[PDB]
Amino acid sequence: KVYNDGYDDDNYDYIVKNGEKWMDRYEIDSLIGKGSFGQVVKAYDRVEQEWVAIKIIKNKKAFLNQAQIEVRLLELMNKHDTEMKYYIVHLKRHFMFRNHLCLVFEMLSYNLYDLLRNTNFRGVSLNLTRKFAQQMCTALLFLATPELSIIHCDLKPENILLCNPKRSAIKIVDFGSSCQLGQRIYQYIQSRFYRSPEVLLGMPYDLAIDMWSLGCILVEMHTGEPLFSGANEVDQMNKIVEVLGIPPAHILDQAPKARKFFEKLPDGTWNLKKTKREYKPPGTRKLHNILGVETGGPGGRRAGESGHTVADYLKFKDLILRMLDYDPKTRIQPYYALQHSFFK
Numbered sequence: 001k002v003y004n005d006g007y008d009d010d011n012y013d014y015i016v017k018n019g020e021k022w023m024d025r026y027e028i029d030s031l032i033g034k035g036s037f038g039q040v041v042k043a044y045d046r047v048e049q050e051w052v053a054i055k056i057i058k059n060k061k062a063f064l065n066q067a068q069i070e071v072r073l074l075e076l077m078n079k080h081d082t083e084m085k086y087y088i089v090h091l092k093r094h095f096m097f098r099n100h101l102c103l104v105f106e107m108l109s110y111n112l113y114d115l116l117r118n119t120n121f122r123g124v125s126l127n128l129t130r131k132f133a134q135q136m137c138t139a140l141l142f143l144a145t146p147e148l149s150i151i152h153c154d155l156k157p158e159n160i161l162l163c164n165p166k167r168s169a170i171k172i173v174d175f176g177s178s179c180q181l182g183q184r185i186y187q188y189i190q191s192r193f194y195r196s197p198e199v200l201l202g203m204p205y206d207l208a209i210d211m212w213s214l215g216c217i218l219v220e221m222h223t224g225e226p227l228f229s230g231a232n233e234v235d236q237m238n239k240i241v242e243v244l245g246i247p248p249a250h251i252l253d254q255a256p257k258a259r260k261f262f263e264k265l266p267d268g269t270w271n272l273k274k275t276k277r278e279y280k281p282p283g284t285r286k287l288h289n290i291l292g293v294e295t296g297g298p299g300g301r302r303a304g305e306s307g308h309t310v311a312d313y314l315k316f317k318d319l320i321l322r323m324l325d326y327d328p329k330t331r332i333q334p335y336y337a338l339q340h341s342f343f344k
């Protein structure tokens with residue numbers, strides 16, 4: 001019958017019903033949320049006797065194909081992360097159910113965007129930020145293992161989950177957009193706020209694009225707001241240039257999409273194309289002041305508060321700037337990010 005025998009909605013999602021029992025094994029409790037891939041559902045595994053989160057993929061070839069890549073990437077991670085000490089959500093198994101691929105995960109709590117909303121977008125503390133930063137650098141270290149070389153390609157606050165509302169532990173979720181070094185190279189990957197300059201410029205990219213995203217995420221987690229909130233690629237590039245200046249000439253010379261944001265003057269120098277919206281001149285929106293290094297943190301909301309010293313902010317800003325290096329050949333890599341003084 002049409003609509004998968006009446007089991008699916010107009011968006012190829014399985015219509016979730018509380019209390020349903022799948023495979024005479026999973027007792028579905030309730031829907032947790034939806035994403036572009038489909039839905040995540042809270043369930044009780046009768047066999048293992050534990051709560052699980054089941055990701056129900058949309059009943060559509062394009063989404064099924066992405067989930068098949070995710071399964072392959074998580075299974076290859078499990079072969080190297082059997083202790084699970086590396087901070088990636090753990091896939092327990094998968095199965096097909098009513099023409100939906102279902103991935104069974106350990107149950108986690110809500111995501112880092114939800115954590116910001118509980119904060120009313122005032123940000124979490126610098127100490128909590130440091131703890132988040134340390135775990136994500138360790139995760140990026142694990143993904144950089146040569147036999148893995150996995151690029152997540154969609155790091156953002158909604159793709160990082162707390163294990164538990166009362167603890168600082170986090171895990172990275174959702175590898176449906178992910179890939180390994182040496183596969184297809186795409187335009188328009190990564191969520192726009194977190195999209196690296198390499199990808200905007202249509203250049204080849206590697207694991208460093210996740211570090212760029214990480215840098216943007218960490219500032220957001222403390223300020224409460226995206227660092228670079230582009231409405232489109234040109235706005236996105238221009239907002240990056242406000243904080244970090246014009247990209248180096250050697251990179252723009254190599255960039256296939258450079259002329260979409262920049263032009264060369266007769267003397268050979270690269271300048272922003274003018275499109276209305278007017279931007280701060282390049283490099284004048286100093287991150288020193290977005291973080292309010294000498295002025296009580298973002299918006300002054302940390303004035304008079306311990307664990308927020310000027311030296312802490314100077315170390316934080318230094319680490320962030322290394323993560324937002326324009327050149328992916330020198331952008332700080334996970335191993336050395338973990339030796340930065342912000343963590344000592």
Ligand SMILES: FC(F)(F)Oc1cccc(-c2cnc3ccc(-c4ccncc4)nn23)c1
Nearest residue numbers: 032033034035040053105107108110173174
């Ligand atoms: F927003 C939606 F994701 F739809 O629903 C949500 C929203 C807030 C949390 C979760 C949640 C709780 N415990 C887990 C474990 C894994 C996963 C996951 C794995 C792979 N890909 C995506 C998610 N999610 N999850 C799912």
Ligand SMILES: [Cl-]
Nearest residue numbers: 286287288289
């Ligand atoms: Cl600065």
